[PDB]
Every structure is written in structure tokens, then in C-alpha cells.
Amino acid sequence: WGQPHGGGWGQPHGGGWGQPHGGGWGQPHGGGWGQ
């Protein structure tokens, strides 16, 4: 198992954390960005 002992573990507090909400963030969508 992996249930919390006091209050959650690695789950978000106000909606995700460092993950994309629509698809991505800084990563390239078609081909690179400003590298």
C-alpha cells in the first residue's frame, strides 16, 4: 500500500504541482524552443 500516515504524501494541495494542466509547460510542442 501507500496511504498517508498523517496527511497525504506526494499529492497536490491546490491542484497539481509541477505537472502540466493542459499538456506541457516549458517543453517543446513542435520542435525545441530557445535552445
CSV table of C-alpha atoms in Angstrom, one decimal:
chain,number,residue,atom,x,y,z
A,1,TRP,CA,0.0,0.0,0.0
A,2,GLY,CA,0.9,3.7,0.2
A,3,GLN,CA,-1.7,5.5,2.2
A,4,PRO,CA,-0.7,8.6,4.2
A,5,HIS,CA,0.2,8.4,7.9
A,6,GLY,CA,-0.5,11.9,8.9
A,7,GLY,CA,-1.7,13.9,5.9
A,8,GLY,CA,-1.1,12.8,2.3
A,9,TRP,CA,2.3,12.3,0.9
A,10,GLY,CA,3.2,13.5,-2.6
A,11,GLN,CA,-0.3,14.6,-3.7
A,12,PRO,CA,-1.1,18.2,-4.7
A,13,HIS,CA,-2.5,20.7,-2.2
A,14,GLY,CA,-4.2,23.1,-4.6
A,15,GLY,CA,-4.2,21.3,-7.9
A,16,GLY,CA,-1.1,19.5,-9.1
A,17,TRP,CA,2.4,20.9,-8.5
A,18,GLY,CA,5.0,20.8,-11.3
A,19,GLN,CA,2.9,18.8,-13.8
A,20,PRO,CA,1.2,20.3,-16.9
A,21,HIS,CA,-2.5,21.2,-16.7
A,22,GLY,CA,-3.3,21.3,-20.4
A,23,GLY,CA,-0.3,19.4,-21.8
A,24,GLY,CA,3.1,20.8,-21.1
A,25,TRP,CA,4.9,23.8,-19.7
A,26,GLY,CA,8.4,24.6,-21.0
A,27,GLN,CA,9.0,21.5,-23.1
A,28,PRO,CA,8.8,21.9,-26.9
A,29,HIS,CA,5.3,21.4,-28.5
A,30,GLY,CA,6.6,21.0,-32.1
A,31,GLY,CA,10.3,21.3,-32.1
A,32,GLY,CA,12.5,22.9,-29.4
A,33,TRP,CA,12.0,26.4,-28.1
A,34,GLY,CA,15.0,28.6,-27.4
A,35,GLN,CA,17.8,26.1,-27.0
